[PDB]
Ligand code: HEC
């Protein structure tokens with residue numbers, strides 16, 4: 001879909017499925033075939049989201065992703 005907000009206990013986080021793509025052109029998050037990647041407090045903190053953010057001047061902070 002477009003903007004998807006993950007309402008977890010530690011602050012909701014906002015996947016701008018659209019706005020990220022309006023820069024990043026799907027492929028950036030999706031190796032050729034776009035599909036539902038399992039996002040969790042495992043994935044989202046290990047590599048998914050993180051490594052891209054790390055690779056730029058990303059919001060490298062908990063409150064940088066989570067509303068608080
Ligand atoms: C990385 C930040 C992403 C961008 C930018 C795009 N997608 Fe994505 N997509 C991403 C995740 C984290 C997920 C899982 C969402 C969930 O809770 O299941 C997805 C999922 C999809 C899906 C599933 C169906 C849907 O979202 O309606 C598809 C088909 C999909 N993504 C397509 C897609 C396209 C076409 C993108 C460019 C406009 C795109 N995604 C960007 C992560 C990210």
Ligand code: HEC
Nearest residue numbers: 013014015020024028029039048049052053056059064065
């Ligand atoms: C690169 C492949 C990215 C992935 C994967 C994710 N994000 Fe991201 N994010 C990315 C960029 C380039 C930026 C914006 C930088 C500037 O001009 O471009 C962001 C920013 C965010 C933000 C902050 C928005 C703001 O007000 O600046 C959020 C909330 C964010 N990203 C969340 C987010 C999540 C939760 C992701 C995985 C589900 C994720 N991003 C992946 C690049 C990339």
Ligand code: HEC
Nearest residue numbers: 006008009010013039040041044049050053061062064065
């Ligand atoms: C954006 C790239 C994130 C950063 C930086 C951090 N977190 Fe995160 N976190 C992110 C996502 C996409 C999720 C998904 C929701 C889920 O419940 O898995 C999470 C989840 C958490 C949770 C879980 C809360 C719950 O209800 O169980 C916590 C406790 C959490 N995140 C904490 C947290 C902290 C302390 C961070 C800084 C070190 C942090 N997150 C960074 C995305 C992102």
